[PDB]
CSV table of C-alpha atoms and ligand atoms in Angstrom, one decimal:
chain,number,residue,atom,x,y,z
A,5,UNK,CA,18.7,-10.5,-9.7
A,6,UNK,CA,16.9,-13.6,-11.7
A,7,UNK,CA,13.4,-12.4,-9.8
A,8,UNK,CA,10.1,-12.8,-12.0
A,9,UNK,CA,7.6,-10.1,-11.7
A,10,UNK,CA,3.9,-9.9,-11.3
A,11,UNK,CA,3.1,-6.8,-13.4
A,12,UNK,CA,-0.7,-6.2,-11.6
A,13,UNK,CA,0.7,-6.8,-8.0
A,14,UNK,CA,0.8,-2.9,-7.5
A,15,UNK,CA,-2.7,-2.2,-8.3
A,16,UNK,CA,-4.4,-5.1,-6.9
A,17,UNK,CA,-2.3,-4.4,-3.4
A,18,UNK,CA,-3.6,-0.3,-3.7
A,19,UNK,CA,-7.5,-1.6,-4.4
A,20,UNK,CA,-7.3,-4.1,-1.4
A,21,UNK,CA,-6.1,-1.1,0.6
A,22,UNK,CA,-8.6,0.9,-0.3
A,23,UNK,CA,-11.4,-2.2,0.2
A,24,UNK,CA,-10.0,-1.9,3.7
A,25,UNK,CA,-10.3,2.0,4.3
A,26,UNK,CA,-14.3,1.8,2.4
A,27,UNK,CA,-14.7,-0.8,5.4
A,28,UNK,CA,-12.6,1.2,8.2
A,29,UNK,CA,-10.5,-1.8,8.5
A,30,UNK,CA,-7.4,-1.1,10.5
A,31,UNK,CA,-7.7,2.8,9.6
A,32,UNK,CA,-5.2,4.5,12.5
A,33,UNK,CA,-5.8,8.1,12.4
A,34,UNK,CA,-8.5,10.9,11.4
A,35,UNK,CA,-7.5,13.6,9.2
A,36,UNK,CA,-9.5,17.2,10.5
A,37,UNK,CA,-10.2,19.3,7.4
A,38,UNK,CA,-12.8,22.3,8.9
A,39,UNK,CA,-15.8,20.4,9.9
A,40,UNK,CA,-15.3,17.2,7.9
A,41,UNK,CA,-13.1,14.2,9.1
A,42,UNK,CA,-11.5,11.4,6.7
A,43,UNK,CA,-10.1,8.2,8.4
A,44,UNK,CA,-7.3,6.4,7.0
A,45,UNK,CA,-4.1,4.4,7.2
A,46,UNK,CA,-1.1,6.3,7.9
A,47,UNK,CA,1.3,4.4,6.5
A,48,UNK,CA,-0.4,5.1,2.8
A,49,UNK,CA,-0.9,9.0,3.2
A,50,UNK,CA,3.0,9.0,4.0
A,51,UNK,CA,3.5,6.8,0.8
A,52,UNK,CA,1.1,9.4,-1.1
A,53,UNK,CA,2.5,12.8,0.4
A,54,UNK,CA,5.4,15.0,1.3
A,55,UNK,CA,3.7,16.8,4.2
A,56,UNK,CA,2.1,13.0,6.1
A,57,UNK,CA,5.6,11.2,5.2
A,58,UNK,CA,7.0,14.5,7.4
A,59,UNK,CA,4.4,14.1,10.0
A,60,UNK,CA,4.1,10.6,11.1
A,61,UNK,CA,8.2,10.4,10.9
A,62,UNK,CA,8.0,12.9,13.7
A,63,UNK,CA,9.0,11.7,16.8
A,64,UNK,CA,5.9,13.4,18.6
A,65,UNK,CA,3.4,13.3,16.0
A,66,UNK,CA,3.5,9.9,14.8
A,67,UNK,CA,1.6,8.6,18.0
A,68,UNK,CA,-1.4,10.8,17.4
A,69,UNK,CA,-4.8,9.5,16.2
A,70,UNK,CA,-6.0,13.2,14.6
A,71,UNK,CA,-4.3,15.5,12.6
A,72,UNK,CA,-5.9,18.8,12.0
A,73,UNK,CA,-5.1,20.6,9.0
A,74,UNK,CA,-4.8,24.2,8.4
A,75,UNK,CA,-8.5,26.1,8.0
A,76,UNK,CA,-7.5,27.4,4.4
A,77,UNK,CA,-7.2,23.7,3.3
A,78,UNK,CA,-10.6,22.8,1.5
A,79,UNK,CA,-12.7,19.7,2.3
A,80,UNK,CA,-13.5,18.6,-1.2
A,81,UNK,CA,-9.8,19.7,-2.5
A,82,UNK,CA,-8.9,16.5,0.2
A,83,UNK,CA,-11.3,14.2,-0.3
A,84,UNK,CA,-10.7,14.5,-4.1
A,85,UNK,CA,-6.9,14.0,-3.3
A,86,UNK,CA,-7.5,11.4,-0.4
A,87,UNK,CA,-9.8,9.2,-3.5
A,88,UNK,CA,-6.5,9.7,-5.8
A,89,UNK,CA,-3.7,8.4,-3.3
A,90,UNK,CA,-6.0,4.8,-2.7
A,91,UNK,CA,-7.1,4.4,-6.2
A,92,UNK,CA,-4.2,6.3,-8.3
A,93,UNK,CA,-7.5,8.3,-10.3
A,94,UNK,CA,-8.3,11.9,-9.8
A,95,UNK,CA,-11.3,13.6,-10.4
A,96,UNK,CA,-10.3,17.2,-12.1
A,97,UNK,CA,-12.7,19.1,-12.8
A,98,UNK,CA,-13.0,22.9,-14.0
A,99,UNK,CA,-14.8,23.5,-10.7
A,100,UNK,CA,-12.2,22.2,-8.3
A,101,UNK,CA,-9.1,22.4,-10.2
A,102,UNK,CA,-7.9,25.7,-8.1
A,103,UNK,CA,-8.8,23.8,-4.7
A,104,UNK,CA,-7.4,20.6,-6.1
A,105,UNK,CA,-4.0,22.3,-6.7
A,106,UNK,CA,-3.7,24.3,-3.5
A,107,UNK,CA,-4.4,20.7,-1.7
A,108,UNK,CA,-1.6,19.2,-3.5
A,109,UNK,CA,0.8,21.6,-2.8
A,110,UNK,CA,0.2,21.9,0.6
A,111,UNK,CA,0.3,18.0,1.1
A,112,UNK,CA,3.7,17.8,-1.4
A,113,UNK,CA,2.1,15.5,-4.3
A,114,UNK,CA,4.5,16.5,-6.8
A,115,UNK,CA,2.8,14.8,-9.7
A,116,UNK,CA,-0.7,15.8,-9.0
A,117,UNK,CA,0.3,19.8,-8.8
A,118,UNK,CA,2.1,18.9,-12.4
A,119,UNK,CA,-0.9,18.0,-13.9
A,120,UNK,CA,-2.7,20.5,-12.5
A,121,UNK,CA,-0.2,23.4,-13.8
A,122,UNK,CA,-0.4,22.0,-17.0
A,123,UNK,CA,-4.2,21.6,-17.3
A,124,UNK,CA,-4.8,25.4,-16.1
A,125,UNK,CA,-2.1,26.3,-18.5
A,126,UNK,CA,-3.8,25.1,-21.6
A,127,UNK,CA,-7.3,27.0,-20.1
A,128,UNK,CA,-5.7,30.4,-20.3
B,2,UNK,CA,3.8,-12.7,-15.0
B,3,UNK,CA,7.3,-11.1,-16.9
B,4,UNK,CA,11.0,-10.5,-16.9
B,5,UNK,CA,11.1,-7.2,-15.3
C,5,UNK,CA,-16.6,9.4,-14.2
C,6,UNK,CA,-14.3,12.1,-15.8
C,7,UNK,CA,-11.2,10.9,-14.0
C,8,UNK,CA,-7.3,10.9,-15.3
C,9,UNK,CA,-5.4,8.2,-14.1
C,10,UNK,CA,-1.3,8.6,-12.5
C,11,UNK,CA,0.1,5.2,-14.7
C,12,UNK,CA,2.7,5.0,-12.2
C,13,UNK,CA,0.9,6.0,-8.7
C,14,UNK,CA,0.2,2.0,-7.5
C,15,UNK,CA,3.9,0.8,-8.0
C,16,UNK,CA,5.3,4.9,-6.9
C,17,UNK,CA,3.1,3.4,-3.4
C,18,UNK,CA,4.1,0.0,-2.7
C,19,UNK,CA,8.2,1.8,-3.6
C,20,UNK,CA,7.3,3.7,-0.4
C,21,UNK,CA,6.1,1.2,2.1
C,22,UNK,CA,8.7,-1.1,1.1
C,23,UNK,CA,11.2,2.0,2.2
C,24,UNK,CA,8.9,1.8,5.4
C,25,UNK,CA,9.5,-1.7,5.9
C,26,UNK,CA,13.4,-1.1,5.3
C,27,UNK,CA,13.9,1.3,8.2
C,28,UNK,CA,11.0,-0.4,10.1
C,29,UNK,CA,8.7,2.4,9.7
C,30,UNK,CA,5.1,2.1,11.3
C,31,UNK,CA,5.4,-1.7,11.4
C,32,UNK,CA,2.9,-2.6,13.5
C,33,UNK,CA,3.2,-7.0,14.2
C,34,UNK,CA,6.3,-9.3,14.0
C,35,UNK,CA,5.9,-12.9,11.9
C,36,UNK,CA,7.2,-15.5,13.7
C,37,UNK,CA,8.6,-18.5,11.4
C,38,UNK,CA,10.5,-20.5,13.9
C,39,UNK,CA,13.5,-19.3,14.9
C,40,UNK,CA,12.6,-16.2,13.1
C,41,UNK,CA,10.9,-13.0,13.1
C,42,UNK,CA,9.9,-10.8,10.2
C,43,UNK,CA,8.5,-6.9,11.2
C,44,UNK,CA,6.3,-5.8,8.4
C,45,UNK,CA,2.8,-3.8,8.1
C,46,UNK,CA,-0.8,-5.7,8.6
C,47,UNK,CA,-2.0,-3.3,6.1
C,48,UNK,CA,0.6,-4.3,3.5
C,49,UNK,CA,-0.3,-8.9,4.4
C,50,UNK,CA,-3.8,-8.3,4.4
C,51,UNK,CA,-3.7,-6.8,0.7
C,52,UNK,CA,-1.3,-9.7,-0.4
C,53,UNK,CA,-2.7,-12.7,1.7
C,54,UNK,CA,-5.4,-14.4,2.5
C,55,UNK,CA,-4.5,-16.0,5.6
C,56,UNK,CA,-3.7,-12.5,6.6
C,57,UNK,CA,-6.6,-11.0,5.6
C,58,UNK,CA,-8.9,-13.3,8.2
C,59,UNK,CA,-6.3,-13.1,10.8
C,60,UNK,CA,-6.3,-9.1,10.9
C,61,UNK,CA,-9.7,-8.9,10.4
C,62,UNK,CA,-10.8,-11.0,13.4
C,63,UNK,CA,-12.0,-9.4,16.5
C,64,UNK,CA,-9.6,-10.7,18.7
C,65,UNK,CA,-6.5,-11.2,16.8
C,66,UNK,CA,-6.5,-7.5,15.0
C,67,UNK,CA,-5.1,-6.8,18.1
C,68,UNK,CA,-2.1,-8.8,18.3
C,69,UNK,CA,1.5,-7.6,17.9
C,70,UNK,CA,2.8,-11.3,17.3
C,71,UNK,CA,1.4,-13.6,14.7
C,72,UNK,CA,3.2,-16.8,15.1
C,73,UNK,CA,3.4,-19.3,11.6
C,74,UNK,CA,2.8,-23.4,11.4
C,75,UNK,CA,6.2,-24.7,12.4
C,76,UNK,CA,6.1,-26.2,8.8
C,77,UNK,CA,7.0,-23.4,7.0
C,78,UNK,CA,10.6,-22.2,6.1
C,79,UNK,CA,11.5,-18.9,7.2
C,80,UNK,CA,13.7,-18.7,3.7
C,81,UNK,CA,10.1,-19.8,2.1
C,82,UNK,CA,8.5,-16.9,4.0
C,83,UNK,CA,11.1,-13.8,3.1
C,84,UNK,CA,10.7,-14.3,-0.7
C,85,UNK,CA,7.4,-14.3,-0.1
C,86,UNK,CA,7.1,-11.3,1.8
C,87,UNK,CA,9.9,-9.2,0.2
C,88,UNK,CA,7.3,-10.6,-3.6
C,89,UNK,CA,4.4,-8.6,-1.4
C,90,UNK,CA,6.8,-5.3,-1.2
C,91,UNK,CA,8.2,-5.2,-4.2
C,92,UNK,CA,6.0,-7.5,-6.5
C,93,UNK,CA,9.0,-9.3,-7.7
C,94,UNK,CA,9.5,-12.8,-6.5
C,95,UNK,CA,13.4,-14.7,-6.7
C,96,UNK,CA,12.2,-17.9,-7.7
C,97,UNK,CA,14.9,-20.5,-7.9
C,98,UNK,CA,15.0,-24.6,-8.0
C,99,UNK,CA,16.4,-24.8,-4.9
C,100,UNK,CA,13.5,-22.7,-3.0
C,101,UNK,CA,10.1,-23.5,-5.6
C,102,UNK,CA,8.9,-26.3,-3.4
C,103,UNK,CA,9.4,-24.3,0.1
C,104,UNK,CA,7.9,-20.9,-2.2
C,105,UNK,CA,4.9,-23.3,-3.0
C,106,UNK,CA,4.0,-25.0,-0.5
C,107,UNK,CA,4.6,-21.1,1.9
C,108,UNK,CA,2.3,-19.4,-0.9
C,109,UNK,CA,-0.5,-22.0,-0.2
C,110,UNK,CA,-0.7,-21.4,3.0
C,111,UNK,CA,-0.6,-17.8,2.8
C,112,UNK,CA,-3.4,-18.1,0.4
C,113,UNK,CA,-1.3,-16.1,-2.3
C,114,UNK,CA,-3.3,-17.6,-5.7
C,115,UNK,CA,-1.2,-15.8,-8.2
C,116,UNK,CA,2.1,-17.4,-6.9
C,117,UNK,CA,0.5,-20.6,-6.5
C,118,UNK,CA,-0.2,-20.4,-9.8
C,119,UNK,CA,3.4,-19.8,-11.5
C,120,UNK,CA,5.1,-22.2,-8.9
C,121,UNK,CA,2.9,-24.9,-10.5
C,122,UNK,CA,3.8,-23.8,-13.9
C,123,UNK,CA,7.0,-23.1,-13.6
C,124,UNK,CA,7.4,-27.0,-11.7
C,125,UNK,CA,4.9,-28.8,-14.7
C,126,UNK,CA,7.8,-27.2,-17.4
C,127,UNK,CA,10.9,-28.8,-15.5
C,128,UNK,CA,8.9,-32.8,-15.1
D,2,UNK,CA,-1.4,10.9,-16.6
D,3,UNK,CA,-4.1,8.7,-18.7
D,4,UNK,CA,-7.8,8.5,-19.9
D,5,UNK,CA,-7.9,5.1,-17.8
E,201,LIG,O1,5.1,14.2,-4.1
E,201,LIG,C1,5.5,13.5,-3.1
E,201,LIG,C2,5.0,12.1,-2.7
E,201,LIG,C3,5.9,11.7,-1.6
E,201,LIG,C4,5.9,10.6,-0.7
E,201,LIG,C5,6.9,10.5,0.3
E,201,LIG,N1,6.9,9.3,0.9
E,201,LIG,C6,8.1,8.6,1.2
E,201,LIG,N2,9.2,9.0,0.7
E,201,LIG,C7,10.3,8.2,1.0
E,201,LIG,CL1,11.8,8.7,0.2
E,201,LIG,N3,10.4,7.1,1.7
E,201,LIG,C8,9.2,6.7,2.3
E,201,LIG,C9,8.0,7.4,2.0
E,201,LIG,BR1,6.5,6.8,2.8
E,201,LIG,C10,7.8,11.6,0.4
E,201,LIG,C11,7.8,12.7,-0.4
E,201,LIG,C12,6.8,12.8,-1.4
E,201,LIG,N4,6.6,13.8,-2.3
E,202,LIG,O1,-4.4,-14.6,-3.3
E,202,LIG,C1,-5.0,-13.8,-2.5
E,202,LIG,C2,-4.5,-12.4,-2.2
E,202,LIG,C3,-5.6,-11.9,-1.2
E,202,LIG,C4,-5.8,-10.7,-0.6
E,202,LIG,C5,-6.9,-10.5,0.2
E,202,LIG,N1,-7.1,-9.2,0.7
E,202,LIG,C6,-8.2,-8.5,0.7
E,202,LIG,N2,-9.3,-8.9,0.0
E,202,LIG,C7,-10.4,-8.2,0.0
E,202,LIG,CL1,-11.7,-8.8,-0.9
E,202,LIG,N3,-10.6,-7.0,0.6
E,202,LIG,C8,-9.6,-6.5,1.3
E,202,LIG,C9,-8.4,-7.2,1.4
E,202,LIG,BR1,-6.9,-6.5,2.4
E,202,LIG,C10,-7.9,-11.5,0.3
E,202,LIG,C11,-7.7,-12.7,-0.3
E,202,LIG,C12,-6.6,-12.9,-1.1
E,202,LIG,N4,-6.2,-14.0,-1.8
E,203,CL,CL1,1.4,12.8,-6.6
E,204,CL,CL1,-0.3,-13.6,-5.2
């Protein structure tokens, strides 16, 4: 086509959507991790991950307001990966790096296990 | 804005 | 902080919910403009809009599933504008700049306000 | 991935 494109429109439309999950704005479900819970939109965490785009696609499961994950999952691990999918920057860190990973394979974010992979990789 |  | 950054995360997200949008996904209110009716995500027109952004986040009209437009604006006016808010690329022609204008300020969509009127001072 |  003969569009024009606004090269920042990406980024400023992912930090309004996370304006609106620091305000609970229009958050639709509550993701369980253990004894912590982590509200937010659907419609991004399918955009962000494997495992949500399979979930809220389901027939069944895309009506439901809580989603519990499975106990191995670690709360930190997800809220580390929760901060990355609204604000595209992840906090790695010797200390999580294992939990991060594990997290990110479990919720399919191809890119984020890449990373991780590499940066144990170069630690051995 | 650019030419994409 | 410490964090890396995924270069391509933002644009990898709004890719996604525009696939949404295309097989009408999680779409959650229907713009009417006129005789017609667009499905898209409040999420997605809050982070683009400003008229959008008051309209969801009022009490009582969060909670409608049809927002209907001033009878002034062109549904033609309206798609571009919406598919720009997808995609961030916007098919601005001659024949539609006035109608993508005049649309954009009442959306309360400053950027494209902004290269409408440029774009129309180079052709006087 | 960056330093951002
Ligand atoms: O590593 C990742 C990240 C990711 C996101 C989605 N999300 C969507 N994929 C498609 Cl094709 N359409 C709409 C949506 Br929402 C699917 C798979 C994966 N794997
Ligand atoms: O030209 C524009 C585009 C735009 C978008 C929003 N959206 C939001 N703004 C804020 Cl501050 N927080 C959350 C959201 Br969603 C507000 C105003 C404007 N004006
Ligand atoms: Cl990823
Ligand atoms: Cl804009």
């Amino acid at each position: 086509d003969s569009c024009i494109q606004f090269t920042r429109h990406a980024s400023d439309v992912l930090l309004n959507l996370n304006r609106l999950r620091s305000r609970d704005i229009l958050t639709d479900v509550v993701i369980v991790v253990s004894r912590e819970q982590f509200r937010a939109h659907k419609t991004v965490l399918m955009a962000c991950s494997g495992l949500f785009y399979s979930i809220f696609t389901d027939q069944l499961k895309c009506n439901l307001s809580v989603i519990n994950l499975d106990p191995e999952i670690n709360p930190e691990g997800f809220c580390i990966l929760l901060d990355f999918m609204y604000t595209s920057r992840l906090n790695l860190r010797e200390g999580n790096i294992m939990a991060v990973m594990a997290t990110a394979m479990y919720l399919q974010m191809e890119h984020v296990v890449d990373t991780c992979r590499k940066f144990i990789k170069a630690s051995e | 804005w650019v030419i994409p």
